[PDB]
Amino acid sequence: ADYVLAIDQGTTSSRAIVFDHSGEIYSTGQLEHDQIFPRAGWVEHNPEQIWNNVREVVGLALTRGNLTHEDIAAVGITNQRETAVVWDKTTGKPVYNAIVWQDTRTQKIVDELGGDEGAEKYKSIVGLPLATYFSGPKIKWILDNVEGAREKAEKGDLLFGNTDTWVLWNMTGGTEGGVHVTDVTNASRTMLMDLDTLSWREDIAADMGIPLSMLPDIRSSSEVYGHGRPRGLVPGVPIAGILGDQQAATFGQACFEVGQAKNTYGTGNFLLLNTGTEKVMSKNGLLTTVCYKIGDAPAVYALEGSIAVTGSLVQWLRDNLGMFEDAPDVEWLAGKVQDNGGAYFVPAFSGLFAPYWRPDARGALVGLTRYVNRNHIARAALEATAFQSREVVDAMNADSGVDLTELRVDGGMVANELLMQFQADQLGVDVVRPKVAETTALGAAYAAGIAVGFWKGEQDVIDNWAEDKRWSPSMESGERERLYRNWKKAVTKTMEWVDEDVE
Amino acid sequence: ADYVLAIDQGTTSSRAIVFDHSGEIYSTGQLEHDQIFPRAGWVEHNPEQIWNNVREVVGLALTRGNLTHEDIAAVGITNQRETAVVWDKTTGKPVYNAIVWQDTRTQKIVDELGGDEGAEKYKSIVGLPLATYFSGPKIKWILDNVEGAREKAEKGDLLFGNTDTWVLWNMTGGTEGGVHVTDVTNASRTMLMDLDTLSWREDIAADMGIPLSMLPDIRSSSEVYGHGRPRGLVPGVPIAGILGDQQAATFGQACFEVGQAKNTYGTGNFLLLNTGTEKVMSKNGLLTTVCYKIGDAPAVYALEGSIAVTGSLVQWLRDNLGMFEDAPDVEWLAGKVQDNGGAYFVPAFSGLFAPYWRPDARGALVGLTRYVNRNHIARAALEATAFQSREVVDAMNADSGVDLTELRVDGGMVANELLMQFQADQLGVDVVRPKVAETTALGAAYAAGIAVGFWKGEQDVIDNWAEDKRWSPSMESGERERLYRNWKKAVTKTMEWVDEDVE
Numbered sequence A, B: 001a002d003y004v005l006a007i008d009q010g011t012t013s014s015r016a017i018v019f020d021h022s023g024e025i026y027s028t029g030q031l032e033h034d035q036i037f038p039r040a041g042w043v044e045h046n047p048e049q050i051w052n053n054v055r056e057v058v059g060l061a062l063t064r065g066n067l068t069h070e071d072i073a074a075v076g077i078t079n080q081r082e083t084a085v086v087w088d089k090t091t092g093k094p095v096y097n098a099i100v101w102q103d104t105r106t107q108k109i110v111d112e113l114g115g116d117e118g119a120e121k122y123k124s125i126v127g128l129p130l131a132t133y134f135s136g137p138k139i140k141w142i143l144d145n146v147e148g149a150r151e152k153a154e155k156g157d158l159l160f161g162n163t164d165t166w167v168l169w170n171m172t173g174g175t176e177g178g179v180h181v182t183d184v185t186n187a188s189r190t191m192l193m194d195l196d197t198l199s200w201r202e203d204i205a206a207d208m209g210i211p212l213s214m215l216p217d218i219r220s221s222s223e224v225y226g227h228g229r230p231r232g233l234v235p236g237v238p239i240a241g242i243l244g245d246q247q248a249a250t251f252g253q254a255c256f257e258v259g260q261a262k263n264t265y266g267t268g269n270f271l272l273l274n275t276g277t278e279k280v281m282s283k284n285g286l287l288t289t290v291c292y293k294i295g296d297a298p299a300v301y302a303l304e305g306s307i308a309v310t311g312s313l314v315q316w317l318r319d320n321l322g323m324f325e326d327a328p329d330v331e332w333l334a335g336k337v338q339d340n341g342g343a344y345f346v347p348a349f350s351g352l353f354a355p356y357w358r359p360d361a362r363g364a365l366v367g368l369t370r371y372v373n374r375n376h377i378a379r380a381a382l383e384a385t386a387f388q389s390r391e392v393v394d395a396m397n398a399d400s401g402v403d404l405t406e407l408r409v410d411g412g413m414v415a416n417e418l419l420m421q422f423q424a425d426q427l428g429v430d431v432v433r434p435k436v437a438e439t440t441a442l443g444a445a446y447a448a449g450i451a452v453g454f455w456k457g458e459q460d461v462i463d464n465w466a467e468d469k470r471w472s473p474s475m476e477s478g479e480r481e482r483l484y485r486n487w488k489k490a491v492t493k494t495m496e497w498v499d500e501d502v503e
Helices: A047-064 A107-114 A135-145 A149-155 A163-171 A202-207 A245-252 A311-319 A374-400 A417-427 A439-452 A458-464 A477-499 B047-064 B107-113 B135-145 B149-155 B163-171 B202-207 B245-252 B311-319 B374-400 B417-427 B439-452 B458-464 B477-499
Strands: A003-009 A013-019 A025-032 A072-079 A085-088 A158-161 A181-183 A217-219 A222-227 A238-244 A260-265 A269-274 A287-292 A300-307 A344-346 A363-368 A406-410 A431-434 A467-471 B003-009 B013-019 B025-032 B072-079 B085-088 B158-161 B181-183 B217-219 B222-227 B238-244 B260-265 B269-276 B287-292 B300-307 B344-346 B363-368 B406-411 B430-434 B467-471
Touching: A003 A047, A003 A163, A003 A439, A013 A047, A013 A439, A025 A047, A047 A163, A072 A163, A072 A245, A072 A439, A085 A163, A107 A135, A135 A149, A149 A158, A158 A163, A163 A181, A163 A222, A163 A238, A181 A238, A222 A439, A238 A245, A238 A439, A245 A260, A245 A269, A245 A287, A245 A300, A245 A439, A260 A374, A269 A287, A269 A374, A300 A374, A311 A374, A344 A374, A344 A477, A363 A477, A374 A417, A374 A477, A406 A417, A417 A431, A417 A467, A417 A477, A439 A458, A477 B477, B003 B047, B003 B163, B003 B439, B013 B047, B013 B439, B025 B047, B047 B163, B072 B163, B072 B245, B072 B439, B085 B163, B107 B135, B135 B149, B149 B158, B158 B163, B163 B181, B163 B222, B163 B238, B181 B238, B222 B439, B238 B245, B238 B439, B245 B260, B245 B269, B245 B287, B245 B300, B245 B439, B260 B374, B269 B287, B269 B374, B300 B374, B311 B374, B344 B374, B344 B477, B363 B477, B374 B417, B374 B477, B406 B417, B417 B430, B417 B467, B417 B477, B439 B458
Parallel strands: A003 A072, A072 A238, A181 A217, A260 A406, A406 A431, B003 B072, B072 B238, B181 B217, B260 B406, B406 B430
Antiparallel strands: A003 A013, A013 A025, A085 A158, A222 A238, A260 A269, A269 A300, A287 A300, A344 A363, A363 B363, A431 A467, B003 B013, B013 B025, B085 B158, B222 B238, B260 B269, B269 B300, B287 B300, B344 B363, B430 B467
């Protein structure tokens, strides 16, 4: 077997990618699944469509690469986190659609669960605030809303799973031999797992009215969970790796050492920092979570931060204000000027931490003078993505003493030299861009190949890890701080106006 | 004679307009003159070109209307203010070009003139801060920098005068009989006139090194100053009206009552409030000026306010940010939505008053959210012109206790019904636009006409004043005030950020 097959079961689509020992793409296949909105704030996925699509991309990837299951040494799985699936273990049929992490129907349940200020109720144990994103409250919604579900869960007839678990169950035979398992990274996103013991917590489960029988067996992120069902496309093939999507991209970037972090650039940004075997609890409102766990080796933990508006800023300037209608890539406008021209963008929800720690939907644009033009505005818009990233990094550093040693990056925006160099300048550490952009799928492959010996372990992966390039800090140190301070000041004053803003 | 000829000697062109008893435009003539920039910040006009242009337009207006000096009952003159002309009274040739109000070369002179007392040194006597705009310091410049000027002056052969004086002198014969006179509105713009007594200040003149022999005799704004020279276009005709442009505009809007004010909408805005016979000194930085004086009658005063960025805002958003390249008229985009969507513009130099009275070049745009689009921005942009006029109105109220009774408007933006309505809504008083848009010229006509009896007086002018349209406040008090205080908070917060913005 010369290849490892990764399945990335994402939010909007699912793809299979076949990798070789070097970490290079051999063949791929991809399909979208429906985003279902039964009503406002509700976001659902049809679980069967997800399975049949996954079934199909695998076939697609093999066919394109002229491969046979005989060529696959292992299958790795990565998935959109938090999305909740509840199905019958006997009929195999879901009792309701998968409730996506984007869904907000559980706001009320989340508010009752916490009680008059209780969002932080479970943080010390599970590392998460009570929010609409996480699985637990979603399972509770399914048990309080669906006819009969709770009684059958009581009986032990219902299974819960993130889609890693849903995909794994179907790939091992479903109602015939299906294994009900999840890894530590995905379990850390449900609100039910104790970060220290890596086990389900009975008290939190009871609090949410969730029978323990619905919960899958928590295992590591790298070990043989099972084998491809006999009559499928990957008959006999070991399925030996699972990592939540962001943890997988982190793993595919080879952020194996303390201080290494991965920043993903999209409409919004996600940043995870490897804090080693030491678990760090945030004082800045950040998430604590599991980065990965390779078999019997100790779990490696992480701090996770998110930024609501990064790449979507420039997209809003275009679709809402009608700017840049002439230029597709804004980088080429920002490059026509030397500076932000005194302009600063206070993106919405940028007021993450100080002085209030209360992100708001209202943003601003300050420092406009007669000289300022759209090239400056393009420049400042890119800077705000970097500034926000820096403020999440400073929060992480303040919480650990594990200071970001370097940033590895993925996402569409990693193709912007200006942004990337400025990101390095602002952070004062190197910024590395991998040669393979699908870090999410690559992480799932590394996790699975390690478990079966296709790769010998973490060090061997580093040896086969190739980078595209890296940017090193070069900006005048004084200019580096001036920009950052003026920006944090802008954020502050903007939040002050917002408090007194009577809408 | 059934007509009154008005000469409007402006910043970029000069025009002649012939009106009849009903205030209608019968015939007109207009010609541009060169805007000379010998140096950065230097702005000059060729006094000879201006004079030639004035004769030619007068000729044009008379010819096109088929009128002769016999049909002209009187001539009125209005002119761009503060611009200074210094000429040889024996040859009638300028010693230098006219230095325009927009010329900033007098900054050093102005800085040192104030000594330890500063810019407000003379404010309590003349109504004006020391600044590059005003005539005094410009006359000093010419004397200190031009050869033979200082001595010719000491002989009594040098004359000064704004363009009103410069035109009246030539019109009455120049070297051969020219009269050297100015009215009180223009005199009050040079910094050398006492507001209470309406006379030249012997001490201020010496402070600036200006012999009193250079200064024109000060008269009222409406009386016969002399008659057109025999070889001219208007031989024997009384020249009986002079008002500085903004005052002319105000007079031509028939703003004859305490509390009536006129707002001129341009790239920037000029607002004047009639304060009656009581001179009011501002505690808000506004200017104190003579509105007009009609013969023996007591002089009427005004408070004057200037707003730097009004019409420029939309221009900037288009020429610099590349927005609205689709809409030459933004009123059509603003009309697609019913409100600003939460957005507020804090235009550069909008911090005219509290908290600091320290206008700054740096502005901002706040209250941005995902749903705000260019339609909201367009409306917010317009709202900002209305808001800044309201704060100038408030500062005028806080200075005198004279409630604005009604706002008369001119300038390019009065075609915008959306803006004029909102303006009425914000001021809570009626906003009216005249049928005759050329208010400055009409104002000069009224003054001259009254001096010769073509009109009986101010009530008679009112009896002939033509009104086009009027807007009544229609916005609920809650919405009205909420929008305004929200904007004022935006201006405040912006100024605070600007104070800590290290650029």
